[PDB]
Write a protein that binds this DNA or RNA. Structure first.
Lengths: 122, 38, 71, 176, 209
RNA sequence: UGCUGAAAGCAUCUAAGCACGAAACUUGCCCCGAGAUGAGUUCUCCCUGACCCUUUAAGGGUCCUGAAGGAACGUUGAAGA
RNA sequence: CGAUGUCGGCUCAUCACAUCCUGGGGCUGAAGUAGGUCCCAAGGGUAUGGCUGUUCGCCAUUUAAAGUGGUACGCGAGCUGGGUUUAGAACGUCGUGAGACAGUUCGGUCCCUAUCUGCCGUGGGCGCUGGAGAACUGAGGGGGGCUGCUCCUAGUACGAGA
RNA sequence: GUGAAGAGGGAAACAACCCAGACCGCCAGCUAAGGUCCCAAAGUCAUGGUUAAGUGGGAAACGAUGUGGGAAGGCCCAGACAGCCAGGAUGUUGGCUUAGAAGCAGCCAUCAUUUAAAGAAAGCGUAAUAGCUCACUGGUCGAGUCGGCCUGCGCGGAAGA
């Protein structure tokens, strides 16, 4: 489960080094998050070239989970770790200038077109 | 709609008409005058 | 009128009008009211078993056969 | 009532056909026009129709005044008719109604498209006006209540479908 | 118009191209043999007894054998009487098959659900459990506080209590048929229907407005 | 909220009349129901002979003649304290 | 007074209606977007974390709303015992002093083998008055009820632009 | 006075209110309190009277031609109140102040002409105007009608587990 106090790795460039989730977002009395959910997040370690500090509060999009993506053909598209990209709440889109690795091609399908042009090869 | 006990001669310009079994007051000589009583 | 009734499920209550009672319960609206004026004890049930009210001018007694009560 | 002194005489060019359920009235401005006043009894003759008390019915001397009120308006309806009471105030609105079909643009996802009651038709003589052809004074009023239902006239412009009331007032909209 | 009695044989998936899995329930419907038609010198209402089965020749009883004897020498284990609406049936015609669904492919299904014994107090009634530590003990899955003090001062109807459960009737109204084969007695329907494998059910062409 | 309209020749959405008006009320929608003594209906299967003794709705026997189906028996179950 | 557990938690719930949300109507200093603000309707819905036993409050953040109150401020032969609280300690205040202090802080054991009412499931016996096997009605009885995000209608309507 | 220091009951059920107050019976009469459409024994009895509402069977200031009683008063058969009609002008483009005001921002005059009749205005609306209301008189309409007061009976103001 990805929920309050879940710790996620960032695929954001020069991004935060330890980050933890709060609440869940997306619906009233909502339970849990997965691939394609945006959640409220807190900074615990920022790295010295970070433009945020400890106890700063942001949003992040979940791009990979150890549970993977469901319903392509009755099977499942599997992954091994829980990873995210931090977002800018004032200007929208990612807080950085590029993204680490190909992330997930589900970002090309319908909803995240302004993200897959910033850096992703997908 | 606010509720009162009477209209108590608030303006003589009022005809004090009954509509659908209840009183309906309307006025031109006093602004914002509307009352369901006589 | 109101005809208030307890269904047997806690505070669960039904209400009607005299219009509704003759429109969909015309044989039962008198049946629920006449029993409250029969004799007390087991004789009340013995008189209630004789009541047998019908509506719509048709009964199950066409060979008994009920004749008009007159003075 | 105090109106039976004036029972209203049938004018030259109007015919009334006598029936125990719904009496009809015919004239050169109204055909298939119906009257139903079941709280009273008629006395129909070759030049007059008067109202009296009905057998077993209870009335405090009033129902023959309300029955005469239908005769009052039907005689003028079937011989001359009634005034136009539907006009659009706004400049960005338009109408093209004809016969038993309504085409009316008032800033909605639908051109009103109404199917009407029986014995009434509508026509647009201008791009902003609607004229109702009919002899039943209740039907030409009730169709106008349905047609004015789109965009009410507001105290800040009045751009809807035109109406009168003693409390009609403009507001100055004084802002910023 | 009428209904069919079958046998639920399992569930699977049949896919689309290039993906989406399309889960489907698999049902076998041997042609319903018919035992009686009414309003034909029997009863004042139009109805058919569709019947499926035959029973065993040394186990069938006299009051059942003599009730099917008008239709033949086999006790068809049940009647399944349906009233006629928007159509007709007669005392001559082929045993009723899945060709009832050859062009009407939206259906409704009636059957008994969740035939799973007693379950348990929480496994049935979806309660919230008490603390497993912090001084709390002996109470965790018991039904809880069954009322409140004096004024109502009684246990309510329409509440949650333990007993023998399941195997009660449910009706499903939103269903589409994927395939039928009258020669191989097959019915294939999109999604799931009440009761485990071996369940009989009733399937009908849709009449919902 | 309106149209038509009155007792009260006016007036008014109401008295007659007609046009609407909410998740509330009614219908539609799913299930339960003959302890329903107030025991409804339809089909199938089974049973229609006498006599002694006794002032006897109390029985004690005899010849003649009857079960449909259940219970029991287990082997067992996706039945079940 | 030959006894009647009291604020808090977890769990199980219910009633009111001066309506917070939802369905609607109306006034306005209702332009529009909103707010201010009242009445028809009680069928349905209505808060998480840091501090504190917290009721309450202070902050942080979610939400269709974060509505008010009854019921011995609901539910310890329901479980718990954080608070109120003796028996221990210590600082202060008071007293000659023992000692007192709803001054303060710390610490502080919770009994149980079920008649009748209530409620769920499930038998025998008896009732349907000839018997045995299956199918079917209907006096009555319960269940349900939406809601974010965004674009097209529309950057149209409205307004000096926003 | 009555209970606490008595019975009987009745008021639906409390000790006391209401009536009664105990020696005991009687297939006897007469009554009190209270009851007499029905449950439930006995009049849906007979006279006129007030209320019009499930009031009776909770809720105030305040307020009301809701409904009766009553005296005086306004409008009234050379004619009434509502409605329909005629209208509601003319001198006048005023005069002083001031930058200014088509009755309707101050004070100055409030007269005369006309007509059935009136004001350069009692009350709204508006620019400073406009547009309306009110005074008032006869034609049509017509015999009762209304305000104020004193009072009897009802009524609205109004929610709870």
């Amino acid at each position: 489960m990805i929920q309050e106090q879940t710790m996620l790795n960032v695929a954001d460039n020069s991004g935060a080094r330890r980050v933890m989730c709060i609440k869940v977002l997306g619906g009233s009395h909502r339970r849990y998050a997965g691939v394609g959910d945006i959640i409220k997040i807190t900074i615990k370690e920022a790295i010295p070239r970070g433009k945020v500090k400890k106890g700063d509060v942001l949003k992040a999009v979940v791009v990979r989970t150890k549970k993977g993506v469901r319903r392509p053909d009755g099977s499942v598209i599997r992954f091994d770790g829980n990873a995210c990209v931090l977002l800018n709440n004032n200007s929208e889109q990612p807080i950085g200038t590029r993204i680490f690795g190909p992330v997930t091609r589900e970002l090309r399908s319908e909803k995240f077109m302004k993200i897959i042009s910033l850096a992703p090869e997908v | 709609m606010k509720v009162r006990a009477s209209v108590k001669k608030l303006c003589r310009n009022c005809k004090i008409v009954k509509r659908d079994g209840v009183i309906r007051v309307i006025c031109s000589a006093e602004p914002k005058h509307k009352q369901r009583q006589g | 009128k109101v005809y208030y009734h307890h269904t047997g499920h806690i505070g669960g209550i039904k209400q009607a009008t005299f219009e509704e009672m003759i429109a969909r319960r015309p044989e039962r609206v008198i049946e629920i009211a006449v029993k409250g004026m029969l004799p007390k004890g087991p004789l009340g049930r013995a008189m209630f078993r004789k009541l047998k009210v019908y509506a719509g001018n048709e009964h199950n007694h066409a060979a008994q056969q009920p004749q008009v009560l007159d003075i | 009532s105090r109106v039976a002194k004036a029972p209203v005489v049938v004018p030259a060019g109007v015919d009334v056909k006598i029936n125990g359920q719904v009496i009809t009235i015919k004239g050169k401005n109204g055909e298939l026009t119906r009257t139903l006043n079941d709280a009273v009894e008629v006395k129909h003759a070759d030049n007059t129709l008067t109202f009296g008390p009905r057998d077993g019915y209870a009335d405090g001397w009033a129902q023959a005044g309300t029955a005469r009120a239908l005769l009052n308006s039907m005689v003028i309806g079937v011989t001359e008719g009634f005034t136009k009471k539907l006009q659009l105030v706004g400049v960005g609105y338009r109408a093209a109604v004809k016969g038993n079909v309504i085409n009316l643009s008032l800033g909605f996802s639908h051109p009103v498209d109404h199917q009407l009651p029986a014995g009434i038709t509508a026509e647009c003589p201008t791009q902003t006006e609607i004229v109702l052809k009919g002899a039943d004074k209740q039907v030409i009023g009730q169709v106008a209540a349905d047609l004015r239902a789109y965009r009410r006239p507001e105290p800040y412009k009045g751009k809807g479908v035109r109406y009168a009331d003693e409390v009609v007032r403009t507001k100055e909209a004084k802002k910023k | 118009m009428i209904g069919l009695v079958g046998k639920k044989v399992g569930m699977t998936r049949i896919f689309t191209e290039d993906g989406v899995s399309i889960p489907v329930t698999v049902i076998e419907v041997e042609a319903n043999r018919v035992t009686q038609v009414k309003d034909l010198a029997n009863d004042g209402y139009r109805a058919i007894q569709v019947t499926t089965g035959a029973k065993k020749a040394n186990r069938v009883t006299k009051p059942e054998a003599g009730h099917f004897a008008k239709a033949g020498v086999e006790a068809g284990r049940g009647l399944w009487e349906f009233r006629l609406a928007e159509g007709e049936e007669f005392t001559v015609g082929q045993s009723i098959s899945v060709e009832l669904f050859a062009d009407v492919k939206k259906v409704d299904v009636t059957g008994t659900s969740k035939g799973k014994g007693f379950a348990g107090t929480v496994k049935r009634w979806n309660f919230r459990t008490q603390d497993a530590t912090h001084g709390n003990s002996l109470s965790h899955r018991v039904p809880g506080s069954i009322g409140q003090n004096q004024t109502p001062g009684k246990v309510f109807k329409g509440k949650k209590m333990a007993g023998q459960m399941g195997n009660e009737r449910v009706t499903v109204q939103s269903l589409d048929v994927v395939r039928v084969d009258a020669e191989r007695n097959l019915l294939l329907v999109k999604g799931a229907v009440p009761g485990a494998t071996g369940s009989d059910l009733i399937v009908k062409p849709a009449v919902k407005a």
